[PDB]
Amino acid sequence: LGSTCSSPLTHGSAAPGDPFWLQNIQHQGIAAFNGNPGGYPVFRNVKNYGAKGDGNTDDTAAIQAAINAGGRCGQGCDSTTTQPALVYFPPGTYKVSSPLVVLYQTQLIGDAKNLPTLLAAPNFSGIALIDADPYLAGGAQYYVNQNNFFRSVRNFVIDLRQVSGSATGIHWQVSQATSLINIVFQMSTAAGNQHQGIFMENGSGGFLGDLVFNGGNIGATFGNQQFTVRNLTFNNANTAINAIWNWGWTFQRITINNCQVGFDLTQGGTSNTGAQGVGAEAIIDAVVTNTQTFVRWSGASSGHLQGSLVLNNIQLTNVPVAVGVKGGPTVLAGGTTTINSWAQGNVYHGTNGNPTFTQGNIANINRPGVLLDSTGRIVSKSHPQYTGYAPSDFVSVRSQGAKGDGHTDDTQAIKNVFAKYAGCKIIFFDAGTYIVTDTIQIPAGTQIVGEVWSVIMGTGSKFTDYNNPQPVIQVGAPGSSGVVEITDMIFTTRGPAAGAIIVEWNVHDPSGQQAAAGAWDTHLIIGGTAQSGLQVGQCPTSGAGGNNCFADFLGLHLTSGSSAYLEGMWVWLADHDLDSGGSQQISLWSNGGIMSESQGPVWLIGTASEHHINYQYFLKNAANHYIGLAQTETPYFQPNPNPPAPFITNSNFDPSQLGQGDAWAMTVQNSHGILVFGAGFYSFFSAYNTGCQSPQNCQNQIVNVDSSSDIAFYSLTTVDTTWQFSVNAQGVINRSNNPNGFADTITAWTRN
Ligand SMILES: *[C@@H]1O[C@H](CO)[C@@H](O[C@@H]2O[C@H](CO)[C@@H](O[C@@H]3O[C@H](CO)[C@@H](O)[C@H](O)[C@@H]3O)[C@H](O)[C@H]2NC(C)=O)[C@H](O)[C@H]1NC(C)=O
Ligand code: NA
Ligand code: NA
Ligand SMILES: [Zn+2]
Ligand SMILES: [Zn+2]
Ligand SMILES: [Zn+2]
């Protein structure tokens, strides 16, 4: 506990009628590497830019000014980390008549106590009320969809009911480090209406959750490589989810009430040169009621894989068809029943490389008890927003002397803040970049909150020695337990930093509070950003930057006694430069992405780890993990050089069996109670050359397990890898058995 208090802060001090704390907290954020840090506003209240919120005045322009102020990353700019915006909406009804363009690095946030309404004018025109990637003349766009990062929308009612024709709430064409949180969509239920909550046509996601859709022809149209979706509820839609294509998604805690079709899945071809449909859906903990068909495939499967489905713990009440084909036969009869574990696709066991094509029950999926809540379902916990807390319940790091200017050493100021306030006040990291040169230990009990781009950036000699790696951030002391909630933070390095363990996570849940220790909208954005020392100017793809281009040793280290609920966390070793212009590829060196030795519970909900040398995920002597979906990419320079270079072998942090020319996506040693429920593990290059994509042999192996680990994989999708699955570094499952469009999919693997 911090020295300023004697009992922990366990609830907020706000009066019931006070506005949400974010409105009146002091606004002190800085964009450290902006052209004008002293004049560029991070926080923008829409009402300060002329918005009335009276439901009659057209507020479109005023909101757009709140978004646009300061000279931001719009047309002609690829991406940025230096032009953030938190666009804030106090309660009210905001009438809008054309799309709100949510520029790169923008969050739209409403009052969480009394959700503001975005009200579509009867004459609304444009792609959607909120547009994260506008289309221009000739079908060019503001941003490349696969690079469309750093976007959030939180705490709104989006009301389309005044629009007589077609209308869409959100054009959510996005990739990683994005979120939708706590939105209610209100749409028409009139026969023939053309309302649609979300339209997403492509991208590389991503996490979204805690949404409610009321009415409409379509709740959400989804098309994207991969995404994790948690706690979506659809009421009275014609089609809840129109899934047009993917490589693979995970849907957790979905509720569908009174719809015609729950999941309408488009079946595509199996060739990587053919039509792409929905490769794979993994659905866990669903409740479906009074709905004609729960899952509908657009075409039938004929004794071989062509679109994968895994269903786990599905409660149906008056749902005649559990799994059906559009204008075709029932595949799984519904009614009123609970589906334990069911699959469509190729099922595998042990070292048997030959598929069992299945459309039927599979062995009950094991769900370790510690990963389940009192209702027996995978834990579901939203981004903590402290809705009952007053501004006085927070302490500002700026007010306590942390500059956040990307230059001043803020190590002592930050240490002092934790020493004084941990557990006494919510720690508010005003937007900025905070240079630290020693370990920042976040005590057990602490709650920390950022502001769009709040970065702790470790650098200097404490972090440069790969023979003696050291933690930049320490989440709890070793052996600690308690609440640790981290929201909207970035943790990273200023290079070179060959010894940095960016986050060492030690704390465990206290008794009786699951997921008390966790992170949301919190990412490790490693290199590729302004004044990181890890940009194209320092680290060209030639590799000429050499020893200057060590970015970290390890992204995330979950230690033996820890637990963690990590939602949407991207542990990204930069493959390209976000700030120099032109999205130029770069070569940076990270030894490994995520290593867990935790005995659990660990929930990795929509996490990703990309471009690390030895592995993206390494589970070493771990237990009780729920992981879904997990997504990975191999670094683009491999196999030039082969792992572990330019690091050296380290028996403490490396797996026993190093990657064969390329990093493992996931490698597992001596672990038990591991459930991987949706995975997207990809390889796109051989030393920056894309030729391997056609023969689909960019790397030879990608997932490794030892002989004894108690682990199961469901809906494991890989890209351009010969052996999708290995035991003891010998390929067992060949991609030739599982072609599923652009990607290849293993529907289930178990040890026995
Ligand atoms: C699924 O997502 C929905 C939408 O965010 C979640 O519903 C929301 O949950 C919060 C937290 O419980 C509710 O706030 C509470 O309201 C009650 C009633 O006034 C109050 O007593 C509490 O102190 C708290 O403020 C909120 O009403 C509710 N919002 C909506 C639109 O339903 C839900 O919790 C999520 N469920 C899971 C399993 O993650
Ligand atoms: Na460009
Ligand atoms: Na360790
Ligand atoms: Zn927050
Ligand atoms: Zn890139
Ligand atoms: Zn435990």
Say if residue 512 is exposed, middle or buried (CB neighbours under 10 Å; 0-12, 13-18, 19+).
Answer: exposed
Identify the residue whose C-alpha is closest to ligand 1 atom 33: 210
Q: How far does residue 370's CA lie from ligand 6's centre (Å)?
A: 8
Q: How many CA atoms lie within 13 A of 140 on its CB side?
A: 8
535 in Cβ contact with 586 (< 8 Å): yes
Ligand 1 binding pocket includes 380 (Cβ within 6 Å): yes
Alpha-carbon span 227 to 206, nearest angstrom? 5
Binding-site annotation, residues for Zn(2+)? 383, 488, 508, 575-576, 600
Please state, in angstroms and as integers, the Cα–Cα distance from residue 654 to each residue in 23, 76, 500, 563, 616, following that order: 47, 42, 15, 21, 11
Q: Is the dihedral of CA 465, 467, 468, 474 positive or negative?
A: positive
- One-letter amino acid of 106: T
Alpha-carbon span 652 to 466, nearest angstrom? 12
For the chain, give every domain's residue range. Answer: 20-361, 391-752
502 in Cβ contact with 532 (< 8 Å): no
Q: How far does residue 386's CA lie from ligand 4's centre (Å)?
A: 8
Say if residue 583 is exposed, middle or buried (CB neighbours under 10 Å; 0-12, 13-18, 19+).
Answer: middle
Residue 245: CB partners within 8 Å, gap ≥ 6? Answer: 202, 223, 224, 266, 268, 276, 277, 278, 279
Peptide bond before 19: cis, by omega within 30 degrees of 0?
A: no
Q: Phi-psi bin for 696: left (phi > 0), alpha (psi -120 to 50), beta?
A: left
95 in Cβ contact with 58 (< 8 Å): yes
Pick the ligand that lies closest to the CA of residue 517.
Answer: 6
Please state, in angstroms and as integers, the Cα–Cα distance from residue 740 to each residue in 27, 244, 292, 362, following that order: 50, 15, 28, 20
Peptide bond before 546: cis, by omega within 30 degrees of 0?
A: no
Pairing between β-strand 432-436 and β-strand 454-458 as defined by DSSP bridges: parallel
Q: What is the per-residue DSSP string for 103-168? A: -TTEEEEE-SSS--EEEE-TT--SS-SEESS-B-GGG-BSS-GGG---EEEEEEEEE-TT-SS-EE
Sheet holding 405-409, edge to edge: 405-409, 432-436, 454-458, 490-493
Which numeric CATH code is attached to 20-361? 2.160.20.10
Q: How far does residue 602's CA lie from ligand 6's centre (Å)?
A: 8
Identify the residue whose C-alpha is closest to ligand 1 atom 12: 382
- Resolution of this entry, Å: 1.7
Alpha-carbon span 115 to 112, nearest angstrom? 6
Ligand 1 mutation pick, 154, 210, 232, max ligand atoms within 8 A of CB: 210
Ligand 1 binding pocket includes 382 (Cβ within 6 Å): yes
Residue written as tokens 């696969």? 146
Q: How far does residue 93's CA lie from ligand 4's centre (Å)?
A: 22
Say if residue 192 is exposed, middle or buried (CB neighbours under 10 Å; 0-12, 13-18, 19+).
Answer: exposed
Identify the residue whose C-alpha is closest to ligand 1 atom 39: 380
Q: How far does residue 690's CA lie from ligand 5's centre (Å)?
A: 13
Identify the residue whose C-alpha is closest to ligand 1 atom 16: 113
CB atoms within 10 A of CB 747: 28
Q: Which atom of ligand 1 is nearest to the CA of 181?
A: 5
Confirm whether 20-361 and 391-752 share one CATH topology.
yes
The CA angle 693-204-97, to the nearest 5 degrees, is 140
Q: Which atom of ligand 1 is nearest to the CA of 381?
A: 39
Q: What are phi and psi of 276, to 5 degrees?
A: -95, 125
Identify the residue whose C-alpha is closest to ligand 1 atom 2: 210
Alpha-carbon span 61 to 45, nearest angstrom? 13
Residue 385: CB partners within 8 Å, gap ≥ 6? Answer: 112, 154, 155, 182
Identify the residue whose C-alpha is closest to ligand 1 atom 32: 212
What tokens appear for 469 in the block?
């790696």
Ligand 1 mutation pick, 231, 377, 514, max ligand atoms within 8 A of CB: 231
Beta bridge partners of 246: 278
Ligand 1 binding pocket includes 182 (Cβ within 6 Å): yes
Residue 262: CB partners within 8 Å, gap ≥ 6? Answer: 234, 240, 241, 254, 256, 288, 291, 293, 294, 295, 296, 319
Please state, in angstroms and as integers, the Cα–Cα distance from residue 724 to each residue in 209, 704, 730, 736, following that order: 30, 9, 11, 9
Q: After which residue numbers is the chain interrupted with C–N beyond 2.5 angstroms?
A: none
- One-letter amino acid of 380: S
282: Cα separation from own chain's centroid: 16
Q: Which atom of ligand 1 is nearest to the CA of 182?
A: 5
Pick the ligand that lies closest to the CA of residue 625.
Answer: 6
Helix (H) or strand (E) holding 299: none
The CA angle 448-408-177, to the nearest 5 degrees, is 40
Ligand 1 mutation pick, 117, 156, 212, max ligand atoms within 8 A of CB: 212
Identify the residue whose C-alpha is closest to ligand 1 atom 11: 382
**Of the options 1.10.3720.10, 2.160.20.10, 3.50.90.10, 3.40.50.620, the CATH number for the domain spanning 391-752:** 2.160.20.10
CB atoms within 10 A of CB 719: 25
What tokens appear for 606 in the block?
């929509």
Please state, in angstroms and as integers, the Cα–Cα distance from residue 138 to each residue in 75, 135, 141, 212, 583, following that order: 14, 8, 9, 35, 22
Residue written as tokens 């994207």? 224
- Nearest by Cα to 469 from 502, 500, 443, 444: 500
Q: How far does residue 511's CA lie from ligand 6's centre (Å)?
A: 10
- Residues lining ion ligand 4 (Cβ < 5 A) are 487
Q: How was this structure determined?
A: X-ray
Identify the residue whose C-alpha is closest to ligand 1 atom 35: 210
Binding-site annotation, residues? 383, 488, 508, 575-576, 600
Q: Is the dihedral of CA 68, 106, 442, 385 positive or negative?
A: positive
Alpha-carbon span 536 to 547, nearest angstrom? 14
Residue 390: CB partners within 8 Å, gap ≥ 6? Answer: 12, 13, 14, 15, 18, 21
Q: How far does residue 739's CA lie from ligand 3's centre (Å)?
A: 37
Residue written as tokens 């469509």? 344
Ligand 1 binding pocket includes 522 (Cβ within 6 Å): no
What single-letter DSSP state applies at residue 124? -
What tokens appear for 470 in the block?
């050291």
Identify the residue whose C-alpha is closest to ligand 1 atom 27: 113
Q: How far does residue 109's CA lie from ligand 4's centre (Å)?
A: 9
Q: How far does residue 387's CA lie from ligand 1's centre (Å)?
A: 11
Q: Which atom of ligand 1 is nearest to the CA of 184?
A: 31
